[PDB]
Design an enzyme around this catalytic site. Sequence first.
Site, PDB file in Angstrom:
ATOM      1  N   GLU A   1     -18.819  57.305  26.385  1.00 14.54           N
ATOM      2  CA  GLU A   1     -18.628  57.179  24.942  1.00 14.54           C
ATOM      3  C   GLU A   1     -19.577  56.184  24.294  1.00 14.54           C
ATOM      4  OE1 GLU A   1     -17.777  53.750  24.568  1.00 14.54           O
ATOM      5  OE2 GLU A   1     -18.156  54.135  26.687  1.00 14.54           O
TER       6      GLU A   1
ATOM      7  N   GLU B   1     -21.107  54.168  27.595  1.00 15.93           N
ATOM      8  CA  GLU B   1     -22.072  55.272  27.524  1.00 15.93           C
ATOM      9  C   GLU B   1     -21.987  56.276  28.665  1.00 15.93           C
ATOM     10  OE1 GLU B   1     -26.076  53.991  27.110  1.00 15.93           O
ATOM     11  OE2 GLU B   1     -25.633  52.500  25.542  1.00 15.93           O
TER      12      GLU B   1
HETATM   13  O1  NCN Z   1     -17.138  50.905  29.430  1.00 19.87           O
HETATM   14  C1  NCN Z   1     -16.656  49.654  29.415  1.00 19.87           C
HETATM   15  O2  NCN Z   1     -15.968  49.179  30.293  1.00 19.87           O
HETATM   16  C2  NCN Z   1     -17.120  48.976  28.130  1.00 19.87           C
HETATM   17  C3  NCN Z   1     -16.578  47.616  28.148  1.00 19.87           C
HETATM   18  C4  NCN Z   1     -16.943  46.858  26.993  1.00 19.87           C
HETATM   19  C5  NCN Z   1     -17.735  47.291  25.915  1.00 19.87           C
HETATM   20  N1  NCN Z   1     -18.195  48.653  26.033  1.00 19.87           N
HETATM   21  C6  NCN Z   1     -19.071  49.298  24.966  1.00 19.87           C
HETATM   22  O3  NCN Z   1     -19.124  48.490  23.817  1.00 19.87           O
HETATM   23  C7  NCN Z   1     -18.409  49.139  22.711  1.00 19.87           C
HETATM   24  C8  NCN Z   1     -17.095  48.657  22.620  1.00 19.87           C
HETATM   25  O4  NCN Z   1     -17.111  47.215  22.452  1.00 19.87           O
HETATM   26  P1  NCN Z   1     -16.410  46.581  21.169  1.00 19.87           P
HETATM   27  O5  NCN Z   1     -16.528  45.082  21.222  1.00 19.87           O
HETATM   28  O6  NCN Z   1     -17.203  47.117  19.842  1.00 19.87           O
HETATM   29  O7  NCN Z   1     -14.974  46.986  21.127  1.00 19.87           O
HETATM   30  C9  NCN Z   1     -18.541  50.638  22.947  1.00 19.87           C
HETATM   31  O8  NCN Z   1     -19.647  51.261  22.228  1.00 19.87           O
HETATM   32  C10 NCN Z   1     -18.661  50.718  24.507  1.00 19.87           C
HETATM   33  O9  NCN Z   1     -19.623  51.753  24.863  1.00 19.87           O
HETATM   34  C11 NCN Z   1     -17.912  49.479  27.098  1.00 19.87           C
HETATM   35  C1  34A Z   2     -24.639  46.783  20.528  1.00 21.59           C
HETATM   36  C2  34A Z   2     -24.375  47.901  21.531  1.00 21.59           C
HETATM   37  C3  34A Z   2     -23.067  48.167  21.941  1.00 21.59           C
HETATM   38  C4  34A Z   2     -22.800  49.158  22.842  1.00 21.59           C
HETATM   39  C5  34A Z   2     -23.858  49.948  23.385  1.00 21.59           C
HETATM   40  N1  34A Z   2     -23.542  50.987  24.336  1.00 21.59           N
HETATM   41  C6  34A Z   2     -25.154  49.719  23.005  1.00 21.59           C
HETATM   42  C7  34A Z   2     -25.446  48.690  22.071  1.00 21.59           C
HETATM   43  C8  34A Z   2     -26.869  48.416  21.636  1.00 21.59           C
END
Ligand code: NCN
Ligand code: 34A
EC number: 2.4.2.21
Lengths: 346, 346
Positions: free
Chosen positions: B171, B314
């Site tokens: 995602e 992602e």
């Molecule tokens: O896949 C994980 O475990 C993961 C853990 C923390 C952050 N992320 C990525 O960061 C985003 C979510 O973080 P946040 O602080 O905006 O809630 C989202 O675009 C995810 O792809 C992803």
């Molecule tokens: C800031 C940010 C947060 C999540 C991801 N996948 C990529 C970027 C660049």
Amino acid sequence: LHALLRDIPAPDAEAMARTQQHIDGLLKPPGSLGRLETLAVQLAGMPGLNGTPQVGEKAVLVMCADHGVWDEGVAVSPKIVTAIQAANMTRGTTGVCVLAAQAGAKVHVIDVGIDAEPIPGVVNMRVARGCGNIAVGPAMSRLQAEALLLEVSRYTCDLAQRGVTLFGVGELGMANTTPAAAMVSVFTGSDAKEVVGIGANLPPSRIDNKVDVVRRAIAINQPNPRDGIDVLSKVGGFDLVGMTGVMLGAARCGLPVLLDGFLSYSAALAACQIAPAVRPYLIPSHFSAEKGARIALAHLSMEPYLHMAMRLGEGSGAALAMPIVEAACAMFHNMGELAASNIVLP
Amino acid sequence: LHALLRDIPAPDAEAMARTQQHIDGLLKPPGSLGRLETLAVQLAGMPGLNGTPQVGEKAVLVMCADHGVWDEGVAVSPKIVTAIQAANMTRGTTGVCVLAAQAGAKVHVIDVGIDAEPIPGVVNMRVARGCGNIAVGPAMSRLQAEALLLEVSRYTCDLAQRGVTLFGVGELGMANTTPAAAMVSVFTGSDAKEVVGIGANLPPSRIDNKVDVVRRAIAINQPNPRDGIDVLSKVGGFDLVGMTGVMLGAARCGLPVLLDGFLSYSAALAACQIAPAVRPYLIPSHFSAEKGARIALAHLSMEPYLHMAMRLGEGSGAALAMPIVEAACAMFHNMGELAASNIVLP
Ligand SMILES: O=C(O)c1ccc[n+]([C@@H]2O[C@H](COP(=O)([O-])O)[C@@H](O)[C@H]2O)c1
Ligand SMILES: Cc1ccc(N)cc1C
Ligand SMILES: O=C(O)c1ccc[n+]([C@@H]2O[C@H](COP(=O)([O-])O)[C@@H](O)[C@H]2O)c1
Ligand SMILES: Cc1ccc(N)cc1C
């Protein structure tokens, strides 16, 4: 050999700094790629990699040898399995061969002491037809250990001249988890019972005898924990010595070495004891299902990347982790940059 | 949709038995390859794989969408990052693209609710310009959730007809670790404080507000833990719904799906709640560095293979584990057999 140990280069902090800065500016939240980033920086510090995380040719070196302690009933696999499997290695039908092929790596099978006639196709560096039974005396003389260390070291760094930039280490030898347990026990100061495992499916009823054999090997040989070579020669084995030699060779060459399982942990403890400068070049692969794995890894301060409950040996775990090393390189070289997408983060 | 859930096939125990027997006879001590063997058997039970562990084409589906809860100050990344990154996905410069390419997999970027103009090159399935702010009401209607579930499910199983046999799910959506924490909290009965993490580098000083937002989202919506769709529609998001849809689609297709990180764990809890029959098709990849990871994984009874401290999202972890799935297949098909080498073990 003193020359060898003396010339192991220190990591290049300058290249590592440039690496860290470049990684931080990649298209992602800083540090979000965790250990993949740390791995890329570590590689960048290795002089043999030319100031950048990269992977050229890959080789897995498998050290094969028999052990006299096999006669103490510490292994259920017939002795000839070492010779047979070593031959299968030349045919690419074994676990390491299949996993190495999948990773695009070449397997080098080296005989450092198999108790059988020479096997065609296998690199010949045999010290003798099996090492001495550590239960009643030393596995080999100090001279023999130092000579094999030097031999394997040169062979290793010589491959570097042919394009190899990443090494994987492995072994093959019935009963070798016994001398490996003894070594771990001695280097970490842990009791035999805490580090002896079932090796290759040793029945739970036969564990006690295996623990007693390890204790006797230590009591009789009195190996000096502060002298890794003394330890290898007394309660080690040809295969363990050879694995240690690969680590020293790669370090001297300024190149990375991927550890495998329990046997490799033993050899790594010895290598780090002999030359601390070797540590920065070691890269963990998987977490061995062998009982004494946690203890050996703790004293090495390593956290494996893969938890597969594997316990085959052969360098199969090493080969399985090679794609991870290339992933850190691909990350470093192929990802785009934050500034180029006009992304500003706090 | 009821038809969909009803037609998810059970694993083929017959093929799994033939698989286990074949693995036991390979050139190695029985069970010595640990989780690699278990993984090969699991694959063999998946009807879409034709009674054997195999991997054809590989795809990673990335569900992108924005969240109304972003306005509650739960994320430090600017909102447009979702749209920008989604565009970068079409250029192959992101973390998943680089790791997917390394694994020989194709990346499918799907917009299920990004708050911006449509992005060319991106599969268009947008439900709306971002989901509702779960802090003051539901993310979407039940109808919208069921419709997206069905849409993504068909798209997924349709790719199966084009040679895809292994899926990776991922995602992209700023602030999505908030609805993911709410979901985990609700499905596992854990308190908000125990499952809320720093997401994409959220300052430690701002965690408290994030925990309060999750609690309010739950108190106001009163999602029913025993109804996965109710939970997704109330405190979830378009991207989480889409990930759930991929898991249902692959399961209906009888094919394996590789989970990614924390967001994927949430979607998997929902999928298993909606249809338990989905579980046998899920394959863990890595262990997310997000605080609530251990709890979500425990309720899923999964033990990831990779410990990389990753938290990018992602679908990068999924892509990183694809080589492991192919390794189990290579093991199964390419290793030689004990009987052929005249090796007899107790
Ligand atoms: O896949 C994980 O475990 C993961 C853990 C923390 C952050 N992320 C990525 O960061 C985003 C979510 O973080 P946040 O602080 O905006 O809630 C989202 O675009 C995810 O792809 C992803
Ligand atoms: C800031 C940010 C947060 C999540 C991801 N996948 C990529 C970027 C660049
Ligand atoms: O690498 C490991 O962690 C490993 C753990 C247990 C057993 N082995 C393999 O099995 C052999 C040693 O087992 P054993 O019972 O003969 O001492 C040897 O040939 C190794 O390659 C390897
Ligand atoms: C019996 C046995 C033991 C170890 C290994 N690597 C292979 C075999 C076949």
